[PDB]
Amino acid sequence: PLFCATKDNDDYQEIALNVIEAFDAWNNTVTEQAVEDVWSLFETSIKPCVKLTNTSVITESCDKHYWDTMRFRYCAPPGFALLRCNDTNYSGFEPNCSKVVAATCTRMMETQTSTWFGFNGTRAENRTYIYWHGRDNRTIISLNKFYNLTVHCKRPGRRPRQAWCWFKGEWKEAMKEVKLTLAKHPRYKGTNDTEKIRFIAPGERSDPEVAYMWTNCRGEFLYCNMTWFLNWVENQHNYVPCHIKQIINTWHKVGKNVYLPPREGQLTCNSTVTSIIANIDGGEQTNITFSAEVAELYRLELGDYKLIEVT
Amino acid sequence: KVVLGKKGDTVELTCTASQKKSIQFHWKNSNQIKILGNQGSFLTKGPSKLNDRADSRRSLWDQGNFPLIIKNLKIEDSDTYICEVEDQKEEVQLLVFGLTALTLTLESPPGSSPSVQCRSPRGKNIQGGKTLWTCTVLQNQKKVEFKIDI
Ligand SMILES: *[C@@H]1O[C@H](CO)[C@@H](O[C@@H]2O[C@H](CO)[C@@H](O[C@@H]3O[C@H](CO)[C@@H](O)[C@H](O)[C@@H]3O)[C@H](O)[C@H]2NC(C)=O)[C@H](O)[C@H]1NC(C)=O
Ligand SMILES: *[C@@H]1O[C@H](CO)[C@@H](O[C@@H]2O[C@H](CO)[C@@H](O)[C@H](O)[C@H]2NC(C)=O)[C@H](O)[C@H]1NC(C)=O
Ligand SMILES: *[C@@H]1O[C@H](CO)[C@@H](O)[C@H](O)[C@H]1NC(C)=O
Ligand SMILES: *[C@@H]1O[C@H](CO)[C@@H](O)[C@H](O)[C@H]1NC(C)=O
Ligand SMILES: *[C@@H]1O[C@H](CO)[C@@H](O)[C@H](O)[C@H]1NC(C)=O
Ligand SMILES: *[C@@H]1O[C@H](CO)[C@@H](O)[C@H](O)[C@H]1NC(C)=O
Ligand SMILES: *[C@@H]1O[C@H](CO)[C@@H](O)[C@H](O)[C@H]1NC(C)=O
Numbered sequence: 001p002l003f004c005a006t007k008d009n010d011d012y013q014e015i016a017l018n019v020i021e022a023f024d025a026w027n028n029t030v031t032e033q034a035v036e037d038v039w040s041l042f043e044t045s046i047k048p049c050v051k052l053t054n055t056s057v058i059t060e061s062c063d064k065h066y067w068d069t070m071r072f073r074y075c076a077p078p079g080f081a082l083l084r085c086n087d088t089n090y091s092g093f094e095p096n097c098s099k100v101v102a103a104t105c106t107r108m109m110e111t112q113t114s115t116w117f118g119f120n121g122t123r124a125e126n127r128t129y130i131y132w133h134g135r136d137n138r139t140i141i142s143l144n145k146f147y148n149l150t151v152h153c154k155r156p157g158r159r160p161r162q163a164w165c166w167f168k169g170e171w172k173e174a175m176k177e178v179k180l181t182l183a184k185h186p187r188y189k190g191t192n193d194t195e196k197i198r199f200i201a202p203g204e205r206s207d208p209e210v211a212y213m214w215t216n217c218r219g220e221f222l223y224c225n226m227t228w229f230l231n232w233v234e235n236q237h238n239y240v241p242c243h244i245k246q247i248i249n250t251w252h253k254v255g256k257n258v259y260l261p262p263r264e265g266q267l268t269c270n271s272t273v274t275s276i277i278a279n280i281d282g283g284e285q286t287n288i289t290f291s292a293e294v295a296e297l298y299r300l301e302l303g304d305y306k307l308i309e310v311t
Numbered sequence: 312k313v314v315l316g317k318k319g320d321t322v323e324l325t326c327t328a329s330q331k332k333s334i335q336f337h338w339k340n341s342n343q344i345k346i347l348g349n350q351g352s353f354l355t356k357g358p359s360k361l362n363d364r365a366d367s368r369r370s371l372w373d374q375g376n377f378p379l380i381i382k383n384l385k386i387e388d389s390d391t392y393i394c395e396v397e398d399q400k401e402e403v404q405l406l407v408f409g410l411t412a413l414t415l416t417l418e419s420p421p422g423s424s425p426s427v428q429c430r431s432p433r434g435k436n437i438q439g440g441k442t443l444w445t446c447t448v449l450q451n452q453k454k455v456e457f458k459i460d461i
């Protein structure tokens with residue numbers, strides 16, 4: 001069990017090791033623990049009033065506090081140590097990483113929860129790269145920070161549960177970059193290259209959090225309709241209307257949480273968009289449909305790590 | 312595997328998987344169009360006709376079982392449905408038919424040419440095709456029983 005230091009930070013330099021190791025973003029006790037810990041943080045940051053599980057109704061003390069301390073760092077437990085794949089060609093799975101490094105603690109991890117897009121991530125670089133599952137076509141896509149991609153959401157200020165989110169940045173060419181880097185990724189897989197490769201929403205009959213883009217702003221859960229943002233960047237607007245909810249479905253466990261009604265003021269958040277959660281269905285044509293898998297956020301944040309034992 | 316159900320009934324198409332790590336299952340039809348699957352504890356639903364009728368017991372996901380439930384069946388809901396987790400994939404053929412009413416008619420899926428056969432409590436077999444106590448329709452190994460009134 002990895003010791004989870006809070007906030008640290010960033011005196012945790014690393015060293016090259018003359019070894020070959022197998023790395024995996026998914027089958028990985030660092031990321032597997034990250035997901036559990038983020039789920040635990042999710043229920044304490046924004047505090048739920050009631051939780052509905054199949055069998056029971058849990059009522060606890062809620063309020064409108066909101067922990068904005070969204071960043072944490074892991075360090076190895078006694079008799080273990082952290083290795084990391086420092087190869088730039090890493091795509092979430094590599095049985096022979098030769099560029100191995102070692103550190104005392106991990107990088108900063110962003111604990112925020114969202115669907116479709118990941119926000120305020122670490123791991124943004126001057127390249128789009130793609131973590132891709134060993135088995136299966138689950139993927140999380142890092143975006144290139146060259147294109148100054150942010151999201152900026154507000155509720156005025158008027159109607160208590162309505163909100164907009166503007167997608168500022170060079171999305172036009174950031175989005176064609178991710179399409180293009182998929183086209184020459186070691187799993188193309190069936191692809192024409194551009195034009196006949198497209199972004200797609202999941203079905204509307206999916207859960208709200210799947211069908212809409214789920215996120216939160218100032219402790220309030222927003223659900224937005226992405227059809228205008230998808231019309232822009234395929235075929236028409238660089239903003240979207242999102243509506244706030246109190247009953248929400250839990251991402252990690254099967255249940256619903258009910259929260260207090262929204263804040264009274266003008267809400268507004270400034271967020272850097274750093275990843276697409278998606279599944280690639282390659283056409284021999286291909287579609288990349290957005291996902292609400294969420295846990296995969298944390299697999300980008302720490303998927304290049306590996307906890308090894310020293311006996 | 313084949314399952315056959317009566318029109319307007321529900322059927323639970325079973326799919327099961329033995330991985331300790333947390334996974335994404337998918338259900339689709341012969342045409343490879345998605346009806347449903349999971350992403351974490353959320354349920355995702357593709358643009359198929361089934362949706363509304365299509366669902367899964369989510370409470371069973373945590374221990375490997377990923378059923379596809381269709382409620383209120385319709386003859387054209389008959390298909391070969393495929394459950395995939397990653398690289399493995401179970402298939403299940405569904406075939407649904409009911410009995411109208413006495414000239415009895417048996418509406419079935421196109422492709423299947425069934426035969427109904429009805430037997431009274433002491434009286435005996437009246438066997439036919441589509442048109443015609445306990446009426447049994449025959450396809451693959453098993454059939455599905457029905458009803459009569461006087
Ligand atoms: C991505 O990061 C930004 C920057 O940390 C997050 O926004 C910031 O976080 C909270 C609200 O989410 C704000 O702090 C509060 O400000 C109000 C005054 O406006 C004050 O009453 C509170 O005591 C607290 O200080 C903060 O203003 C806001 N700042 C900016 C620049 O946006 C954002 O929420 C993160 N996004 C996600 C999706 O987690
Ligand atoms: C990842 O997507 C690809 C699609 O590019 C799938 O792999 C094969 O794709 C070809 C045509 O592109 C099909 O003929 C094969 O049937 C596909 N293989 C399968 C289904 O095993 C594949 O669906 C995805 N990868 C995995 C591991 O499921
Ligand atoms: C890790 O690799 C990068 C470039 O791939 C290099 O600049 C850096 O110095 C390396 N660090 C270690 C500790 O090997
Ligand atoms: C998971 O990772 C460990 C250590 O890298 C390895 O022993 C195991 O084979 C991997 N795969 C599975 C399916 O457990
Ligand atoms: C940064 O990203 C842009 C867009 O991909 C690329 O064209 C440029 O060459 C990159 N610059 C550096 C210094 O890596
Ligand atoms: C990037 O976007 C942010 C947020 O809108 C903006 O403040 C900034 O001026 C932009 N440009 C650069 C070069 O940072
Ligand atoms: C988003 O708006 C479109 C455009 O009218 C609408 O058809 C759709 O129902 C909305 N999306 C969802 C998930 O409800």
